[PDB]
């Protein structure tokens, strides 16, 4: 009574939990483990194991072996972790193709190990999240919302349908968002990100690396001296100086969010919403209807052409406007804002 965790024997066991949070370890042998209610951590260990999580958010920890396992997470948001396949010691399972693990949540299997002529699988059902290994991997989602993490290596991630959250990690990764409203994080290394259809979101870290960004259909967002961004020329310089070796390739992105430092953002011919956040920012909208937000600090705004609406927020903001343009809106906010008609 009043015991939450259990570790099994080296033989065949049948382990059942309760409505509380349990950590259930089966060790050697063929074990059937049920987590029941709550959030549970299930580790079958070596042997052919059948694992259930029932309701709640469960976690399955897999080991370095070729023996297949059956996993059914039931209701709730569930994840499976494959980090223990590659370890500093000696690895028993073969990876002769050099692909770590391969996951297809649409076809409900995980290729946990692979020799040249033999392929070892796991049967996975009702699991929405996957965590990869230190080597390169292939991660594929399904029609639901998935969280996919690649960890180290040169991984490839496909989210499938729905609103996903894809992580690349260290190394040079390939991330595909597919249909839905996705969120893409690249991490360290030189990556390329494309979200496809739907409204996507990209997050960058202002490091010394080169990334390729592709925003397909829909309105898409990128978030970060500060940066020098020119969507018209399709180039963003991360450290604020043009022509640097730390730059990004940008295509099909309409909205930009700046850094807390001093940034320079210029918009293309489409409709753009540009946000500068903290610091002294210089913002130009180009042509078409645009929305500009300078945030804190003293900012300078252009709104070159079209029916634009400009907000200055807190600070000593400066405005440039053409006297022959029509359909514009200005709002200096708090401070001694100045308007210039000499442009």
């Amino acid at each position, epitope marked *: 009574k009043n015991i939450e965790n259990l570790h099994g024997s080296r033989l065949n066991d049948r382990i059942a939990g309760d409505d509380q949070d349990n950590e259930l370890w089966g060790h050697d042998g063929n074990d059937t483990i049920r987590g029941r209610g709550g959030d549970d951590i299930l580790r079958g260990g070596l042997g052919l194991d059948t694992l259930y999580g029932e309701d709640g958010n469960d976690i399955f920890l897999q080991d370095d072996e070729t023996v297949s396992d059956d996993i059914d997470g039931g209701a709730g948001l569930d994840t499976v972790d494959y980090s223990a396949m590659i370890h500093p010691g000696r690895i028993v399972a073969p990876h002769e193709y050099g692909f770590g693990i391969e996951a297809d949540l649409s076809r409900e299997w995980v290729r946990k190990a692979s020799a040249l002529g033999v392929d070892y699988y796991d049967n996975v059902r009702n699991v929405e999240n996957v965590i990869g290994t230190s080597m390169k991997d292939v991660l594929i989602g399904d029609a639901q919302a998935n969280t996919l993490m690649g960890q180290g290596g040169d991984d490839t991630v496909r989210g499938g349908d729905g609103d996903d959250l894809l992580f690349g990690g260290d190394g040079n990764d390939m991330l595909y968002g597919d249909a839905g409203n996705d969120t893409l994080y690249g991490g360290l290394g030189d990556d390329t990100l494309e979200g496809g259809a739907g409204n996507d979101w990209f997050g960058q870290t202002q490091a010394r690396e080169h990334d390729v960004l592709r925003g397909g259909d829909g309105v898409d967002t990128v978030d970060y001296l500060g940066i*020098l961004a020119d969507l*018209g*020329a*399709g180039r963003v310089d991360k450290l604020g100086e043009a022509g640097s070796s730390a730059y990004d390739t940008v295509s099909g992105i309409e909205n930009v969010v700046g850094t807390e430092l001093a940034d320079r953002i210029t918009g293309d011919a489409q409709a753009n919403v540009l946000r500068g956040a903290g610091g002294a920012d*210089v913002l130009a909208g180009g042509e078409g209807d645009d929305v500009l937000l300078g945030g804190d600090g003293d900012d300078q705004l252009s709104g070159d052409a079209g029916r634009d609406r400009l907000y200055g927020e807190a600070g000593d903001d400066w405005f*440039f406007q053409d006297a022959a343009n029509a359909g514009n809106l200005l709002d200096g906010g708090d401070g001694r804002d100045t308007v210039d008609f*000499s442009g």
Partner: antibody
Amino acid sequence: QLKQSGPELVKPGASVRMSCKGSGYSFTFHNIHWVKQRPGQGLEWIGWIYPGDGNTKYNEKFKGKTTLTVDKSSNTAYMLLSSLTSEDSAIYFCAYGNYYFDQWGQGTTLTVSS
Amino acid sequence: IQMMQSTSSLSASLGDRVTISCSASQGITNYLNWYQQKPDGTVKLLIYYTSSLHSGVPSRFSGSGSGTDYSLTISNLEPEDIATYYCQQYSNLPWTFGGGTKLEIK
């Protein structure tokens, strides 16, 4: 629109400073680049200066003989040429833009002879 | 990046279609510009990307290409299209221009 200085006549070995004047919008939103054009030749890029902070980037083969300066107050850009030689006679253009040069000047002629 | 414009001279009659091609030593990932220099000496920007048209230019001009080969095309020539055209890149420092192609009416 950018306004440049008139034609200049100089003796070899001397130094000449050239001017390029614009407006607040151009110097606030854009970098300023300098381009030369030798007679019977094409166009060569020298470098740019950022008027807001004065930071500079130079072409490697023009590093020694070129110094870029900017006067943010009066919106004037200056290029200083040193050790003028017979290969330095050309027409010098100033243009503003970040990755593409949007507006060009009318040009300034430099004559190196005696 | 050394940038090549093999066709130094071109000729066409009013209403013809003209193609000017420029090539690069390596990949430029669509980071190329086209400029016009009239006989009077003025220099103007025509397209500020591989295909993006500038504000003040007519719809006659158009550009395309990808990788190491790019081209500027005149759909229907006009008596104001006599000038020299250059190709410039911003993919790697220093930024380099092309040799130039001159257009003279037949």
